[model samples]
Target: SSSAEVVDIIHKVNGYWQTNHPEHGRSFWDNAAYHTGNMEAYFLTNKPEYLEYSKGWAEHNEWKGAKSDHKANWKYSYGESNDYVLFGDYQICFQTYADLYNLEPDTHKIARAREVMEYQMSTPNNDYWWWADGLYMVMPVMTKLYNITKNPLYLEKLHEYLAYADSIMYDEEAGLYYRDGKYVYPKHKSVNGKKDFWARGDGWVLAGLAKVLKDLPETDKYRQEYIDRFRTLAKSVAACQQPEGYWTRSMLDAQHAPGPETSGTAFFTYGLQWGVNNGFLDSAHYQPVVEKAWKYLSTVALQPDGKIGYVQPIGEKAIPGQVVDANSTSNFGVGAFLLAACERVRYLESLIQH
Candidate 1:
């Protein structure tokens, strides 16, 4: 069954990431996504060793919060310092800890996650989520915390922060999001002279929307809004999918320095499958796209040794000259693989029931 293949790929990718850990320059954001993917693989396969591996890493890292009262924690391109706090990268770690806490109900993990999210929410920074990728990194953490504690404030703050992000990054006319505020207007244009929406950036939004929707309560007044946004994004994203089954780094025009990129492709595939599985997207219309994406993701992204390749290196936007090949691996790229594979395994299992 394809589920077996999914499991095999998950194990392989997890191993690859662990072995190639960017230890020297590792940051909290990357490690969070990295470990979350490993945990998801453990959850899906019921493998205790995978869970232990993730736990071991977390233990080594001390479950430190994203920000300190120093400027060094704000930096993203290097090691963790007081100025290196990035909203998107930091939130992935929170969600991972939340997920782990959910499975084990560990008080320490829960407290650490809540402390981080609370501090982030209360922070006076207007640009906490100034970029599209922040949606994937942080929104899910908000929902996860809300699901666990029934904290209405979490959802309220989530919507508020999302609205702030929307005002800066989302382009209503293009039906996509810019990488961040800096790229929104005159500064950014697609290779075709249209709006520039990076594939991975939009993928982050699409997948993030799906994830937040999963935890949003039906009684919440904003639930339908999220559903509608999700549907609209799904239609827009599917329309943009290149014939090659991979979304180019630049979304609108594949010819603009086109090539296969795994992280965005895997995230979109996961989002598409999540939509179909959750009844938000019509299976008849979206399943083909998801299937095609899965084929490309499985064949092109997965290395023989399980290392996910062609991942765009860490950056806020698509860079024309960036080299991402089979050997170009990252923790977040493998995290995206686990996410896609987990959903893929479930999707395949549902096929058997039908």
Candidate 2:
């Protein structure tokens, strides 16, 4: 019953806004990424409004990201221009594009995503995914496209690019990510000279890894490695979670930048529940963590007006002194909140079935 109530709270927030939020535009990842979770919210609620809102977003953008005709424009920097075809921010919309296509069965829906990543894979650029954010922003696009096209190249390229991201950003011993190459341990440190794992950045990777493992086959060679990484990172994050259920912006050094953060907590919730739903985590071991997290999201983070707050402002790395409080919010942060809430519904259903 409490779980069902949790779903109700999620709908209360989603239905309150109902596409009223800003950040709606083509080529903007902030707006586009929200639909990835919105689309799923539609499935769980069967609320046509959510799906319709997301569909209009897809159609308004003409079923593609920022538009550019020349193949040479398909570059993969972190930029937001129309020419950055292979940019992960642009590619993130493909998760929804591919999902929307699954229901509508439209070839035009996925043509650009197919062409761009297909071409990127054809090239020798395995390092296109050079950051932790890219892992969440693009890795799923690979599996989704592969499912549609039945092409092995999508899987191959996923691992290739993920390898680049992990080799550079992931800490093998600590089992956490360093935001990006610049933040890797001694090269950069928190105010306390401790290893700084940006809560939202690793949130991207942790949840991204679950998204990957959720879709991967048992026979895939990379499956075990991902599972190990997920478990390792899950344990580390679990250890860091505050009594309030929110994680600090700087995970290892609490005093370095301490506050209740939502976006990171949301993704970690999604990732942990995904692990449980898929049999990787024992419910007895992980359920209380989810309960504490949902309590924080429901009581502490959800603003009276239905906006999710306490989200750190968007940046590549965590800024402790920059002021992320109960009022701070963003499209991507709410998107992640919606994502975790949707998974909460799924977890609740699994319990009743058991």
Q: In order, what is each prediction's RMSD in angstroms? A: 3.1, 2.1
TM-score (C-alpha, index-matched) for candidate 2 = 0.94
Candidate 1 vs. true structure, TM-score: 0.89
Q: Which window of 10 residues has the lowest lDDT sum in candidate 1? A: 71-80
Q: What is the C-alpha lDDT of each candidate?
A: 0.77, 0.82
State every prediction's TM-score relative to the real structure: 0.89, 0.94
Best by lDDT: 2
Q: Compared with the true structure, what per-residue lDDT tens digits does model 2 show for residues 75-176?
A: 787777888887788888888888889988989999988887887888987789877888888888887887788888788778888888888988987889
Work out how many backbone clashes candidate 1 has.
15
Q: Across residues 256-340, which tens digit of lDDT does each residue of candidate 1 receive?
A: 6567888888889988899999999999999999988988888887879887888888753544654466667787788887888
Weakest 10 consecutive residues, lDDT, candidate 2? Answer: 315-324
